[PDB]
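Example 3.
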Amino acid sequence: KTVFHLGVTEADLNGATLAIIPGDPARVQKIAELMDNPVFLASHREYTVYRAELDGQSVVVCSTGIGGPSTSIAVEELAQLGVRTFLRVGTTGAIQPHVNVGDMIVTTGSVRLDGASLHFAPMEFPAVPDFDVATAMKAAAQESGATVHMGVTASSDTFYPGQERYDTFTGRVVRRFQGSMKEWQDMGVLNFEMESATLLTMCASSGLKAGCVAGVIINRTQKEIPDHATLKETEARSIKVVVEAARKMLK
Amino acid sequence: KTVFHLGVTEADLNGATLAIIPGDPARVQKIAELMDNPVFLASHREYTVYRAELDGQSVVVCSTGIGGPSTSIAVEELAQLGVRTFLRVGTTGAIQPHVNVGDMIVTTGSVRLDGASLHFAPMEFPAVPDFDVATAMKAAAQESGATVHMGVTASSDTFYPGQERYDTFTGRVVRRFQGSMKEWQDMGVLNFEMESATLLTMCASSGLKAGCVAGVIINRTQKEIPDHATLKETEARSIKVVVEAARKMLK
Amino acid sequence: KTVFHLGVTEADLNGATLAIIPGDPARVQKIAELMDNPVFLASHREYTVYRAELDGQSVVVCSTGIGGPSTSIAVEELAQLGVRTFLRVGTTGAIQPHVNVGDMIVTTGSVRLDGASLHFAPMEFPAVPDFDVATAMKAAAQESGATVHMGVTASSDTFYPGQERYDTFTGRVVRRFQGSMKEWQDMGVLNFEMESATLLTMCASSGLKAGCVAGVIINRTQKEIPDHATLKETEARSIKVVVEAARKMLK
Amino acid sequence: TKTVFHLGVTEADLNGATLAIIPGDPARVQKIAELMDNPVFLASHREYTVYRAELDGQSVVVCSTGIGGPSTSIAVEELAQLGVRTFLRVGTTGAIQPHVNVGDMIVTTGSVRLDGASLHFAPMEFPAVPDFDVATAMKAAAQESGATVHMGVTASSDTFYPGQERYDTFTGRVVRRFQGSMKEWQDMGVLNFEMESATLLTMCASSGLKAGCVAGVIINRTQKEIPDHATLKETEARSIKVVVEAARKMLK
Amino acid sequence: TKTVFHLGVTEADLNGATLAIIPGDPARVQKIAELMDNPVFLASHREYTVYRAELDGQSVVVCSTGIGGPSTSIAVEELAQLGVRTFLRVGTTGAIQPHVNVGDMIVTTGSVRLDGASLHFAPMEFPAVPDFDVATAMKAAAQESGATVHMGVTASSDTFYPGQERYDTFTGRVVRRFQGSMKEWQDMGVLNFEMESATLLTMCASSGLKAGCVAGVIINRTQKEIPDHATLKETEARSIKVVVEAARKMLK
Amino acid sequence: TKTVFHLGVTEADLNGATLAIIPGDPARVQKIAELMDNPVFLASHREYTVYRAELDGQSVVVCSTGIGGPSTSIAVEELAQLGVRTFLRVGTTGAIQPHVNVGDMIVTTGSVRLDGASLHFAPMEFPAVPDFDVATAMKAAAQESGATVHMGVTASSDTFYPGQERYDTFTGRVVRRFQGSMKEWQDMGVLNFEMESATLLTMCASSGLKAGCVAGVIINRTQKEIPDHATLKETEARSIKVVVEAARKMLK
Ligand SMILES: O=c1cc[nH]c(=O)[nH]1
Ligand SMILES: O=c1cc[nH]c(=O)[nH]1
Ligand SMILES: O=c1cc[nH]c(=O)[nH]1
Ligand SMILES: O=c1cc[nH]c(=O)[nH]1
Ligand SMILES: O=c1cc[nH]c(=O)[nH]1
Ligand SMILES: O=c1cc[nH]c(=O)[nH]1
Ligand SMILES: [Cl-]
Ligand SMILES: [Cl-]
Ligand SMILES: [Cl-]
Ligand SMILES: [Cl-]
Ligand SMILES: [Cl-]
Ligand SMILES: [Cl-]
Ligand SMILES: [Cl-]
Ligand SMILES: [Cl-]
Ligand code: NA
Ligand code: NA
Ligand code: NA
Ligand code: NA
Ligand code: NA
Ligand code: NA
């Protein structure tokens, strides 16, 4: 009756059918405390799980860890317990010169640079969000006063070569990814992160509602390693937006 | 300059930056006449081109023919002549039992079962619409009184084997497509058509805004025959909806 | 009894088992009038259909539109009505310096740069003409007095990026097609067009005889512009050649 | 002097370590480190808990990877930036062959690349294989512990559920690519499923880094019996004793 | 002045030959050469036995390829460095259509590329098709010999066993890719299986060389998997008479 | 019992052998057999020359493969039908790393699958890896001989020319897939090129057969010096002494 990795039961969720799924286990309590009656449920591996209440309805907050594989486990196990809507929040690197640190991006579709999406649907299938979730995320971001961009997200199984970073141990990027950042830039792609392709393909092919919003922590036309100075303020804004987006999805 | 296939010049379009692109040449005049001052511009091969005025702004109506290849020529040549927004309309058959004849579908992403999309972006890239166009299409469709479905469309380079039809000369479907209709049904795909993967991938990777709307006229899962009045109503409603969606994009 | 797109019945074809399939609906009547007793049968979308008599035998002439998708519908529906041999006549761009405007090309195999051929056979399968049809087309083309080239044709789902054209709205070509025209030139490929890969693969995997012949309307390597008179003669010779090739196929 | 972005440590923090033991679970990091001398906590950020210890007088890092190739690839790269050149993966696992019993140990000789991150280092043709010295040391350490040791191929999946052909799930569906896959791997002699070795081995073998994987079997997909609690606890303890003894063999 | 790496012959050794007949079995080389005038042994190294001869006063090379695209690609390349521009393949084959009889001939109009070496010359989209004049010469030579000749598509496999969907093997298994493949090709109208035409035709058609393939049917897969030796000599004698007359038509 | 179709031998002809040494060149078969006791010629057909000998009182087969995965796959299959379970490949190789000299030996720990026949046994994700016992025996035999021995990844190509990125050819062209590929493999630490290991190791690892590859370096693609005849002859002799000693270590 406890799910295998997350360590929670259906009763622990207290009726929740919506989950906010940040990446970092440390963001879980912060998100829960933006809501009412936050309650710690479990922590195992990269999965920290809280419940809280938003306009009187239970919401679960569960970290995913980095990457499609760990995200896919959390989504499956939460779905087993009745969760049907998944709101992903995370950090991201902008590809376009005009998208600045602190701006918010809402993904309209993901470039599938991952492996786990292929475990749910063949490559032809679109990694696209639920329209209601994407609409809620746009409205929450805009209502908050943020600068918001809607568009395509390149979603990579690596932080380093698949985002065409060269300041690395080998300084090498495999042929597939050489020139890839400028290719995505010329195609209008807004940003890089590491989970949206898996999450959106999995949910869109499995009857689950999902969307992604992310705060820009670096502009890749400038540099490869994000500055620490701006991380906390961008993170605070993103989680305020995602909780408001959850409020708009409650029925 | 006159573009190679469409036979029109930039001056012929009178400043239009938006095009409505049906598949059937005979539907071009029917769409144009819902607007002010429709004028025939050209007809060559499958490309019949009219200009009209909507709220005082010039709009193009141009047929695409069947399939991504002929669609890709029309979109490119119109873009050479200043068009930046492309609204695809038609009627369609559904593959989900809950979708009824006369309902509308607004595509949120396409399964790329085509070839021409690969001439613009590798298969990983999402065949997704511009979010403003999809939003305007949803609103216009709802305001028509129709029941509207937002969701994924399977976009095939064939009418017969790629839609898993067996009632054919050979009665065979190649390995790739055996079992495919049930596969898409179980992944929540709403419908089949033959152009959206090429159109959406081309435009999303080229800085052009695109979307697709279709009224439903048949359903692979419901064996009954719809009434003539309903099919006539659905055709009329689809084109009223696309023109109202264009009005929302120009505003 | 009436096929879904072409609008004709088996009886309308008066026993024809051979069709000549140009791309452009306006060339159908021209081809039919080179034969005896031409009869208009139907026009719907890009499909204009005539019948005529050649040495006392019925022959269908049916346009395909541009691209594999629209071609695949016409071939299927004609095969449902008893047609077994398909002769494709069409325009092409030569990419070899020794091939001049006005020469003929008879395709011995196609580079499958399309999507619809994969709806009939996996990529490993050769896009190959029927040997009797290719033999008949070579003989007809040579007997006309034309200079005739037998060889490989690159068959693309786009006119622009898949033929490595840069004079376009974006001026970009996706990675797959960058450098591709020089690649095909160095591999001895003669020309680009947009339907032979689908046609030849579909027919060679479905028990239908097919072949393709084309007059060269431009050479991608020559800066000189062809005479209006030269293009006119080339158009006329191409259709006289395909009718002669049809004569040689009748049994 | 830089601190690497995800792990939050500097080169000086590692005290000269050129070998890392990389379990998946952050809670297992301290448990491995305490088998060595002078264990010290360095950092914990996200799924990455980092300790340093000393083995026969040499510095060794212990750093968790999280689940899956993506988070693993970050840890390996950032440790390599700080001088680490040898990576010893440890963990427990479930087998797909009837002759491999719970509590047995598997040393991977190559991985089926059912992941995505391996493709960010080398095209699919490239073999996901371990360094031969690491695999040799892992085999010897596993045998010296008294365990039954199997050398062979591991299927390394980006999912726990469909990519391991599990049907007891929310949708109950497995995509076409993975339908029949478990039987296919069983008939090809594959030993086990796990979720990180394809990425780890391909990344390292293509980047001048020495890597290997050793695991304890925590389930056998073909057996009805359920292992007892003592057996599972013994297998956990044995797997980390084994990887520390394999490290000792690599340092000498 | 060069001696090619594998064939062990120089351009002077070929006495001006621009046409080669390329059987697979080295023992067939002398048999083909003796159907022509003034045959001379040139070299034998590995699976490559090379003779020259004269046909209608013109020099002709005969060189074995061995089995498979890789060894064929070496012989074709090295002969092309020494001036050969036309390559006539003769070999044996298994029919996959019930009406084709043992002893019939097949002239390939295009090959299903079930090989790997063709991809070393052109991507998979490129058609494995013969030169039209060679195919035409082979059809006419085959008809004129009295044989029953079929023109059509050939499935060209890198293996004799699983890629031809044979089950009478050590494991009895066929990998997923090839399960059902023989019936799939049969329903697509494919005539036969062999092992070199995909590589040869793709290499040549993408390299400015003229090539074609003719093969004698030694088995029909409607009946059995292992060919009978009974009529093998008869089929082989007819096949080589045909290929020499096809060469005569190409020189004319 | 039956005579296998290509090799032309029966189970009784092998006198109980369950281990085969499989060189590439048919002329090397007798030389290997004569390093053992009581060598007996069994058959020669096409590229397949087959001998039997005795090693420490046990029957061993020696069978050539020809060049390439396709002809290798036939020999391994037919030997397996006759009871062979362990296959020791010896062959020549071109090194691509500057540190690997002519006369050194390479023992493959995994192959880059630049072939087609491996895909007839397992999908591309599957690793082309050796049996751990065979690789261990080859390393020991090679090191005990006094040779300098390298363990690592081998690029296994269906061509000698474009798939090894040679431009010194009739067209001077290398298809897009292989342009830049030698530097890519060099930077990924790949040791050498040959033409059979991917097929052999994938086939065997997915079919319950034990296989490994050892190779003598006959050229280095990064070196301008040409090796002298004496060095080449010594390398040839050492490679077959090594493979015989590795067989000795595999006998039970
Ligand atoms: O550049 C960035 C920043 C955050 N997360 C990513 O994946 N990439
Ligand atoms: O089934 C159908 C109906 C309309 N258009 C399509 O492409 N398929
Ligand atoms: O260049 C050309 C000319 C005609 N048709 C094509 O497809 N391309
Ligand atoms: O079955 C199992 C057990 C542990 N880890 C996995 O990935 N699969
Ligand atoms: O069946 C057969 C016979 C000969 N050669 C082949 O490749 N297959
Ligand atoms: O360079 C070389 C030398 C021998 N064998 C090969 O395959 N390549
Ligand atoms: Cl996060
Ligand atoms: Cl329409
Ligand atoms: Cl958008
Ligand atoms: Cl035309
Ligand atoms: Cl034919
Ligand atoms: Cl762990
Ligand atoms: Cl032969
Ligand atoms: Cl050898
Ligand atoms: Na993780
Ligand atoms: Na909206
Ligand atoms: Na069309
Ligand atoms: Na002919
Ligand atoms: Na061979
Ligand atoms: Na060892």
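The radius of gyration of chain C is 17 Å. Residues 1-251 of chain C form a domain with the Rossmann fold fold (CATH 3.40.50.1580).
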